[PDB]
Amino acid sequence: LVLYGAPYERAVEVLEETLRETGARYALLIDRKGFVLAHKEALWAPKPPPLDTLATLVASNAAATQALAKLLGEARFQEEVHQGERMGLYVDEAGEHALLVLVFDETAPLGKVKLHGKRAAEALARIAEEALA
């Protein structure tokens, strides 16, 4: 998967609107190998952790949790939320081959992270499908 030109612009605007609606810090669209396709940071937030590193670790986790999903009777998980004391991550599918990642702190309410995250994942899935066909 590779986005450039118009579809890239469109994915970046989705990530921008998603950050405004959720109050999350960083939003990324990544492939399942961990390659960053697009990313946006909230102006107010500090410098993120290295985002390629974050993406590789999220893609490792997505491959690894499939065995557990299969034990529950499904090919893979659709979404996962990992909460620390102060930081959390929401990961959702953007179609078959990509993942939306949102990194948030206590100032994003989780309900919004998940609601606008789902919506963003669907918009990104259309972008990704249209760019792949």
* Binding stretches for its own copies (CB under 8 A): 49-50, 53-54, 57-58, 60-61, 64-65, 67-69, 71-74, 76-87, 89, 103
Complex with Mg ion: residue 45 or 132, whichever CB lies closer = 132
Complex with Mg ion: residue 41 or 93, whichever CB lies closer = 93
Complex with Mg ion: residue 52 or 122, whichever CB lies closer = 122
Residue 93 binding target from Mg ion, its own copies, none, CB below 5 to 8 Å by type? Mg ion
> Strand ranges (DSSP E) for 71-133?
79-83, 88-93, 98-104
Task: Using alpha carbons, list the distances in angstroms from residue 18 to 13, 34, 38, 49, 67.
Answer: 8, 21, 13, 19, 30
Complex with its own copies: residue 5 or 50, whichever CB lies closer = 50
Best CA proximity match to 114, nearest among 85, 82, 86: 82
The least distance separating Mg ion from the CB of residue 12, rounded to whole angstroms, comes to 20
The least distance separating its own copies from the CB of residue 15, rounded to whole angstroms, comes to 18
92 is in an annotated binding site: yes
Residues that bind Mg ion (CB under 5 A): 78, 92-93
The one-letter amino acid at 27? A
79 is in an annotated binding site: yes
Residue 20 binding target from its own copies, Mg ion, none, CB below 5 to 8 Å by type? none
**Contact between residue 103 and residue 88 where contact means Cβ atoms under 8 Å apart:** yes
Tell me the two tokens of residue 31: 């492939």
